Amino acid sequence: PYQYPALTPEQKKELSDIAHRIVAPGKGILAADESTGSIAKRLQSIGTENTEENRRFYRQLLLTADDRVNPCIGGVILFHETLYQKADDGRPFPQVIKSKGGVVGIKVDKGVVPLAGTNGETTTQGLDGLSERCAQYKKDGADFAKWRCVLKIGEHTPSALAIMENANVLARYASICQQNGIVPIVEPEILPDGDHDLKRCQYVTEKVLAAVYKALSDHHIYLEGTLLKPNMVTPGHACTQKFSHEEIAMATVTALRRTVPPAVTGITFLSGGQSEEEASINLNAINKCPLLKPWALTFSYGRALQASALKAWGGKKENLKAAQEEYVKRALANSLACQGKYTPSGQAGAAASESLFVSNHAY
Amino acid sequence: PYQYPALTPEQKKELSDIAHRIVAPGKGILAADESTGSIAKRLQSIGTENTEENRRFYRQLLLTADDRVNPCIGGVILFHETLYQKADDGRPFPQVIKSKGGVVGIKVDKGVVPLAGTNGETTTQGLDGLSERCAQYKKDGADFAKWRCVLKIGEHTPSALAIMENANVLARYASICQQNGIVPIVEPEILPDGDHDLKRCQYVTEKVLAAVYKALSDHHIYLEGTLLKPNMVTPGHACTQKFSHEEIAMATVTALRRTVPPAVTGITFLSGGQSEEEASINLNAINKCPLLKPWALTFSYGRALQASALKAWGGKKENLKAAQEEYVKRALANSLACQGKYTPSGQAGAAASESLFVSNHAY
């Protein structure tokens, strides 16, 4: 084949720097990018109305936590609405995030759509006019983006079509982000749903990630300028066999070593409906696994950083400080777990043990 | 692999019937789907303002031509704006088209976008919310759609990435149309630009169409419910060697026999900046080619049906009838040429001999 270089040297240097800053040692990502429909369900649980103001106040509570959180969070993923909101003190949230050391990110996909002729498999849409939105977001403060693809384990799933198509669409979104100075987080999520055992999840994760990195190569994507956000390798939600944290860790780190090139700057796990603590305990075993792990291995957590906070908050403005503390507890814990220095040992208040699992068809 | 049938038997029967009606013997397609920006250039040429009303009047002039045109046109491709306009007598254009025997079609792509890391190659966008637009259009009278992909011949073009990506995106659009009862016209256009000879165009067309039909198979597309709209195989615009019409015909029909399955219902050529007459003369040689041609071989022409009409019209309302006649001449001629019964022999007024070639980068 033949080169017509996608990016210049300076564009490459800019992408590699943003990627590296996000997952610097001790740091992970807050995923705060729930659309209106999905944050509505979380506000319902605490009997709070889904208005714009409550969404603004709840995001302000996460983003203005005290400075124990600054070395813990390298990046915060926002939903379009929040990127344009302001804290009570007048500053725009992107400014709030950057003044505490963080990089601002934006969810740019437009959700999943059905693949015809499949057993309920999806691809994800959002490419239309993506270039133009990325250039606006970059001007508005965001340096990284996020696009989620969803695969399912089943008797005949994932299919070759679902794998191919989802890999190809992640590569297209990645190319378009890099052109506009934004680091793409590639997220090929394999759902936990079903009763498969640890080893089926591990084999399917290996096959999906191999298709992903071939697609990214075919689309000329600069890997040092990307991050990956995969599922850990766990057994299925309904699996009756029990696996230990070190088995989850070994499986995960062995699946990643077989597929992800050492040039990828880091890997930022999703939590997948693991509880707050379980999600920290698995991250910490992953980072204690004796194999050579040539990339950062950190967190990009949504529900596993927010659950105790949401429940402490309760929609009451006077619980603000109790709610922030509960998030700061979890941020400290995952900042230790991504270094393999997390000590479960009671400690802290000790964030939720309640599962955050929701089942991911229509739901 | 394993079946979860994309379509039911009745959905299949509906798709095959619409496809077959469009390209019934003697019939072809009027492409009248120029967006606002592209019809502006044609109205400029005749010193006429690009307002909505002039666009409405000019489309009315094509769509209400007398009944010599009824057996000639099986289908008319419209731009979104026109699908909602009305003739002077109060009827909506879809109604005008159907009362004269025609099937209404709608352009649903949103144009081409650059592929990074390539020598100026494009893919085409428009998938976002395509399902929802197709279901509305189907309710509003359209039964078929059109989506154009553009490839270029050059020293290192088309690339494997451009071929793969364009094939995959045509397959996605096709799947989504079939789900909503619309027959997709798949259009993998290979531009005429450049100085390549007939045999390079033929080899590139064979390679592109093979990738297209594999992609459509991987996406489970029902082929009897589709039409193809390819370029004829011609030498490049700047090629100095001269080829005859029978060489153009043989090359074209030999490239199609090697790639397009007999299940495809028909093939509706684009004109590509050939003049009105040349476009008719090539169609008629294609349909006189002695090889076995197991699909309809007809026209889906934009500029090659409209040029003499536009020039006769001149933006003057009193030339209406002179302008219609000029379109009806061309419609009769292509209705004969798709049967291999067209007699060039002076005849008619004899539509333009002027090339309609425009060069297809920014332009």
Next chain:
Amino acid sequence: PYQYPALTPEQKKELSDIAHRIVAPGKGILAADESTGSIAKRLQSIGTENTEENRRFYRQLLLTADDRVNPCIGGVILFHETLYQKADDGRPFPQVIKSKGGVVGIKVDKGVVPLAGTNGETTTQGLDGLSERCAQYKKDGADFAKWRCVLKIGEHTPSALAIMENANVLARYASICQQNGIVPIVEPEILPDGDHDLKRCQYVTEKVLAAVYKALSDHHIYLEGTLLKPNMVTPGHACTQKFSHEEIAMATVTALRRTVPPAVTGITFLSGGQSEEEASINLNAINKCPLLKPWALTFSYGRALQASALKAWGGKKENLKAAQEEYVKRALANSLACQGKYTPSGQAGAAASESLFVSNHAY
């Protein structure tokens, strides 16, 4: 992409002529290419020793049948040993075949080998030094070759790997034959084993043949110079639902129209353990199917032309003429069935109704 033409015009003309002569109207193929190990089992059934001489005598009995067979057989596929044997009158068998109007063919594969990490799937070997063997065989009288690949229908079979790998290896063998003036018969056999219904066989056949024709395109194979030898689409051996001959015919011809380009010169079905008569009755329905069938649709039968002959022969030299008649009956019948002119109506002696099914693992 870019051309460095695999073949010259004269090489192409030679290949297309041999292909067309083999499947001229009324003609089919005798597959007489059982290796030593497989003809041993057939000679055991008639209590006859598997010596070289009995193998020679039995092949002589097929190849010197009287001239009712001349217009019926366009081609005869031999095993390497037989290509070098002589009839009792001194002539080499290739000479015997050619003097009766036939084209000589040679089996050049070296059997199937296991694909690791699969549920018992195979690929087929034989490429090593294939070029050199083809050039010798061409000098020794053969003009076409045969290479068999085997796929299986099961819960997770065929796999994507089995499909891909078998398609790729057929394309390699085809390229190498064409370079040496030999027409390759491409044989992607999907076994009848298992209890799947007609529609699973049809879907799997469509997916396999699409991968095959894409592979042949990627390897630059001249399609007019090839023949295909696929399975008809039938339900599985152990399927309890019953399908009629016209359902078998429709399924088959609908699967072929969706995948096989009109340039392929012909399609020469295998029998697959159908009895002599059933194999003739299905061929004749296939050729009565009302759809447009743009290629020859004929037979390349092994067991379905030989069973009554073998049993009449019995290893006794005095039954020679009774055995030949029994083969000539079957040759006449398939020559009518490939024209859709076969009349079952008792008639003839009426060749075996006994199934020729053997189950195709180790066996």
Next chain:
Amino acid sequence: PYQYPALTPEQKKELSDIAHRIVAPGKGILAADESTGSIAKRLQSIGTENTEENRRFYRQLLLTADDRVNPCIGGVILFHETLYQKADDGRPFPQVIKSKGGVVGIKVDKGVVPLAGTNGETTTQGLDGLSERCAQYKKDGADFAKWRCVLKIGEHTPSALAIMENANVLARYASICQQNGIVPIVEPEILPDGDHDLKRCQYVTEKVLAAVYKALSDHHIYLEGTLLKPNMVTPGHACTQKFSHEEIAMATVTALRRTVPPAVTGITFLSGGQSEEEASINLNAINKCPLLKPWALTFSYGRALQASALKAWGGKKENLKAAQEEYVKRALANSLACQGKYTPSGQAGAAASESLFVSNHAY
């Protein structure tokens, strides 16, 4: 997709152990596997007859060098003939190699063959009966194998077909080795021929290696049980621009980080017609490159370990010891260079500075 595990746990453990032992720190590979035709040219250069005995004596001179070589050589690749020869003291060479700490390897490919319809591109043959040869070789003392594929940089080379086909055939050979307890060395050589600059070699190497690791994944190959033998990234032989050793090192290590998973056990470079010293100097810069190199980075050298030895030997039995010393010099140097501890600084006798470049068409 779905698992039917290619290998058991114990087979995996055996493969990973052999792979790891070969490229233990300080160790590299002697490639002594020149076929008869290729060692003939090297014996001609020193006016020595190409008999079996001289081939035996010359291999004995390499394999019985004194024990300074034991910690330097983890593995020795032999040609089939040599695997069955004996040293003068009666021991079989495999025994000689193992008693000095080494692992015995065997070349199992059967050379390259032309790909039709390409600009002189090749694939490589040798799969036929590979399973059976691997099981014999394993019994005869070999634990690893070697199979070389050759790609060329040119105006339209490598083509997509050449890349695909060569990747697929390396994956097939690898699968078959692993089944028989042999560690496959995968060697996708990109020739140095031509006038391309460093950056074209680097881009082509990235594209080839991405296709290779996808193919190995599709064929279920256990990566911990493999080694890679690629070209370093250098400019072309006829390139007029000059590049430094650190540019060669950076390019090489940046191309490998982008494509080769961390599970691959090691990477054993070929020399490619670099002189003895240049080949050591590049290995040592590669291993001083500041980036994270998660696999061993060592040598699998043929001509770059033998040139001064061959020339000192001269076919004279009395120069034996002078010839061995000359090989031991080079072995020490590459054992230091694979640790990034090699000091060019005059030193030693100082092995050839003469280029070992031969041009690799017919030649």
